[PDB]
Each structure stands twice: as structure tokens, then as C-alpha cells.
Design a protein around this ligand. Structure first.
Ligand code: BDM
Length: 162
């Protein structure tokens, strides 16, 4: 199980229910780091995607609303249902794409971090949950420079030590 995110230099991930930046490169790598997988997102991050569902991947939406409707998405109500779905699934990798409340609900079962680090600093109200960095190794790092230098970003892959 991977966590799929993008943060500024201080850890910020969101502002007013939406992204605090607009960084097309990093949403091209959202679509294909989850083309094909089981993608888990919290109800509010699902409602803030422009197309609902975004296509070619299993969108699982985590909501406490018993009645919620999301045509074409897998609507569950606790973490045990996520993993009961993933157990049925097998051959699809599970990627937790946010936001903060859902990262906290899977904080013990993530093995890989897929983090995009912005060089700048943005204003908002939601930060990435604290994690033990010391328990992971950075395996891969690729940097992309943008003409807004706040937007220059690094894609890191981190994997959990034995
Ligand atoms: C709520 O705002 C968003 C937050 C994200 C969250 C996010 C972004 N980027 C990264 N790397 N990590 C994240 N956690 C994705 C997103 O739409 C992804 C949509 C991409 C399209 C393809 C787009 C394209 O390639 O131009 C898709 O179907 O996947 C939106 Br809109």
C-alpha cells in the first residue's frame, strides 16, 4: 500500500477544499501512478476532482454518510471495507491518495511513499500527517524545474526499511 501525495516545502497539501497550487505536470503523474490501481480518497477530496469519477482506475470513496451516492465509484464506510475490497482484487495495487483524514486512517499500513515536493511555500489550511521518515529509505528522486520557481518539484519514492 502506497500513499500518493504532493506537498510544498513546509508540508502543506490543501487550501479551502482544493489544491493550494496548479501544477499540471504532477496531475499527469496522478493519472498514471494510478492508471489501473485501486485508488482511495476521502469523500471531500473525491467531490473536489473536476470529473467524478476520474477514469481507468477503481475510485474507492471513504464516507460516514450511509446514503452517499457516487455512480461508478466503490462507496465504503470504514477502513476494514477498503481492505475487504483489496483482498477481492488481488492483482490491483492499493494507492491512498488523500486527503489528511484518510492518510491518518491508513497511517499504519503504508509501505511506500510517492511524494512530490514543491520548492516553494503556499498558503493554505491542510498539511500532510506526520510520518516516521527515519523508517523509510528514498529509493528514487527525479527533479522537474518550472518557470514559476515555487513550482519546481521533485518526485520521490520512499520504501519502508525491514
Ligand atoms: C482536487 O484537486 C486535485 C487534486 C489531486 C491530488 C494530487 C495531485 N497531484 C499529486 N501528485 N498528488 C495529489 N495528491 C488530483 C487532481 O486531479 C487529477 C486529474 C488528472 C486526470 C488526468 C489529467 C491530465 O493528465 O492532464 C485523471 O483522470 O487522472 C485534482 Br483536480
Amino acid at each position: 500500500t502506497a500513499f500518493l501525495w504532493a506537498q510544498d516545502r513546509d508540508g502543506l497539501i490543501g487550501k479551502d477544499g482544493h489544491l493550494p497550487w496548479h501544477l499540471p505536470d504532477d496531475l499527469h503523474y496522478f493519472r498514471a501512478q494510478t492508471v489501473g490501481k485501486i485508488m482511495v480518497v476521502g469523500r471531500r477530496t473525491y467531490e473536489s476532482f473536476p470529473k467524478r469519477p476520474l477514469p481507468e482506475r477503481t475510485n474507492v470513496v471513504l464516507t460516514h454518510q450511509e446514503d452517499y451516492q457516487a455512480q461508478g465509484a466503490v462507496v465504503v464506510h470504514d477502513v476494514a471495507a477498503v481492505f475487504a475490497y483489496a483482498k477481492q482484487h488481488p492483482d490491483q495495487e492499493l494507492v491512498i491518495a488523500g486527503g489528511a483524514q484518510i492518510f491518518t486512517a491508513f497511517k499504519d499500513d503504508v509501505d511506500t511513499l510517492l511524494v512530490t515536493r514543491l520548492a516553494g511555500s503556499f498558503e493554505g489550511d491542510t498539511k500532510m500527517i506526520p510520518l516516521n521518515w527515519d523508517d523509510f529509505t528514498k529509493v528514487s528522486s527525479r527533479t522537474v524545474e518550472d518557470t514559476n520557481p515555487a513550482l519546481t518539484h521533485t518526485y520521490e519514492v520512499w520504501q519502508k526499511k525491514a
